[PDB]
């Protein structure tokens, strides 16, 4: 199975279930997304590079950087912002869907990511207990 | 879209491939797995509730309670308890991600449970920052 997506998509053209994938652009600093995002949306970067993140007065969180070929999406409180000139590929999670049944390879690569990000904030909160438990 | 796999667990044209899975019971209260558990593998609730949660030092916190056609995973950094008697299918990874390319709905449960339980410890970070912050 290809697992390289932007490559996928090529091949196909953008066609059938894939033509569902919209493109945007966000410039360096640019904020794509946060909980203030109304619908489960699915985003691909497709070049440039995002970071998903908590920032507070007293304290900061990386969840992950993002670069091409990663997918990701926004049904977590995360921020997600544009380090540089970034492009994306999103589509609501319906769509997602219908394209992975077609195309197992997005949710594959999807795993990967969530399971990344599940196990580093896992990570965190251990951190945080470690200090609150010590003090 | 219902990503519950009940449905697919009662279809013939599933049959076989769940074949491949092991099965093992639980009765209520027993541990399934824990963040030390060496093998990877996945394994969907066939009857039965699951949950899912992070113990460290004095603390615990649930992530997500998991329904009869939700699937999770072991090396994720979870313990996992039955909430009442439990039957579960697991395989090891490889063979999953190879059978995900021929039945692609089980991962789109996956992609379902994996944002649930990252949308969840998101919001234990976000709770612990407040209730640890001092002036």
Redesign the interface.
Known sequence: ?DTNLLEVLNSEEYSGVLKEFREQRYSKKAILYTPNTERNLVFLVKSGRVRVY?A?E??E?T?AILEAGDIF?T????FIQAMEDTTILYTD??NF?NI??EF?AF??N??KV??D???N??????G??????HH
């Open positions: 199975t908590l507070y007293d304290k969180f969840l999406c049904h977590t409180r995360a999670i319906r869907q992975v049944v197992p949710s594959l999807m795993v969530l399971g990000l599940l196990k904030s896992l990570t965190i909160i251990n945080l207990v470690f200090l609150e438990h």
